[PDB]
Design a protein around this ligand. Structure first.
Ligand SMILES: *[B]([O])([O])[C]([C]C1=[C][C]=[C][C]=[C]1)[N]C(=O)[C]([C]C1=[C][C]=[C][C]=[C]1)[N]C(=O)C1=[C]N=[C][C]=N1
Ligand SMILES: *[B]([O])([O])[C]([C]C1=[C][C]=[C][C]=[C]1)[N]C(=O)[C]([C]C1=[C][C]=[C][C]=[C]1)[N]C(=O)C1=[C]N=[C][C]=N1
Lengths: 203, 203
């Protein structure tokens, strides 16, 4: 056949600070999308790069407002709204992405970047977040969970209103996975972030 | 035949502050391109001229956010987000350019311009950058390495994941070149930037 012309996507292992593992629906199956966030000193801004649509940008702003409202439940700095520039980048560039099922993935990445606590990278997430912190049901559960099982991820966070859709999965992938059902984003942040900080916090 | 129609590409020799050599792909063939960055006193702005597309404009901001995050690894001034203005120019002005494959070139040019250390100009380079330093593979490798050989450049910097496309090259070209394979951009910045700045610092 010749030179191998595709690279199979594969799970990461160690916990990263500022990074979270999301799941995406494409018309040729599901894929793993990785969301990464940096928090540098600045004046309070929000760059959103990676060819993102408008629904995804609005979901990132909703996640940031939820974290601005609860700045001492998670150990965030006291005034990051005024001293810290945030940059959300979803690689790769030159591939357009859209949709809101990425709300809790961006919430996890942003809260990991602001308070220097790593995020576990062997748990794939999906779900839509609101401004009170409610996790709302999403679409395309079957393809996303299939492609997460193909790539060696064995733990999922998923909205609680999607357990009706866990009957159309194949039995082989449903025995492989450990589904956690949530209905509130504080459970997600308590389960994903490692308890102890590593980096120096950005002033 | 008369007056020559097409001026050929030429490689520079001397190290220069603020420039870096990049490769590009056209459907006719490869091309050399040069990135230029100026860092003058100002208030923190980012002009991007030369008919750049959106993906290339986002590559520039991802590279700059990376460098704002690691500001004492490379001897950058500790507050350049407030005090300098950057301007990235890609000659020539009339031809539209697009795509994210030139992130490693822009990161080298920006770090050279900010840290006052000249970058080596006998090394062509290419590669997509992400927000935490990981290089991402690119496409169209043989046209670019072919065009860099017949312009007189015998050192390439290439992503690690593009090692598999090096068997498309002819044998004499591959014996001519000296490929260096990278994963992080710290490796690229150590290989390209000379020590010991040769300009007074912008402050
Ligand atoms: B979610 O709404 O089901 C999800 C949003 C998402 C995924 C990953 C990263 C950021 C956001 N949507 C998708 O999977 C979308 C397609 C879509 C969007 C809205 C409604 C229905 C379907 N995925 C993409 O657009 C995509 C696909 N492949 C690569 C990159 N992006
Ligand atoms: B990269 O995306 O492959 C590369 C980035 C680049 C290189 C050199 C100078 C500026 C930018 N771009 C290209 O190779 C593109 C073609 C392309 C675009 C999108 C995806 C893949 C490839 N070509 C140009 O920008 C170009 C080439 N020659 C003259 C003018 N522009």
């Amino acid at each position: 056949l010749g030179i191998p012309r595709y690279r199979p996507d594969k799970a990461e292992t160690e916990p990263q600070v500022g990074t979270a593992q999301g799941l995406a629906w494409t018309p040729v199956g599901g894929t793993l999308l990785t969301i990464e966030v940096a928090a540098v000193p600045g004046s309070g801004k929000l760059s959103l790069t990676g060819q993102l649509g408008e629904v995804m940008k609005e979901s990132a702003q909703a996640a940031l407002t939820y974290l601005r409202a609860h700045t001492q439940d998670y150990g965030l700095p006291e005034d990051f709204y005024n001293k810290v520039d945030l940059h959300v980048h979803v690689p790769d560039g030159a591939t357009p992405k859209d949709g809101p099922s990425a709300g809790i993935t961006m919430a996890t990445a942003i809260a990991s970047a602001l308070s220097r606590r790593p995020a576990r990278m062997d748990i794939a997430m999906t779900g839509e977040v609101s401004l009170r912190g409610k996790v709302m049901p999403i679409g395309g559960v079957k393809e996303k969970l299939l492609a997460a099982h193909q790539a060696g991820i064995h733990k999922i966070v998923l909205p609680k209103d999607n357990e009706a859709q866990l009957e159309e999965l194949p039995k082989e992938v449903l025995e492989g996975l450990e589904i956690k059902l949530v209905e509130d984003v504080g459970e997600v942040l308590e389960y994903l972030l490692l308890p102890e900080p590593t980096m120096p916090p950005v002033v």
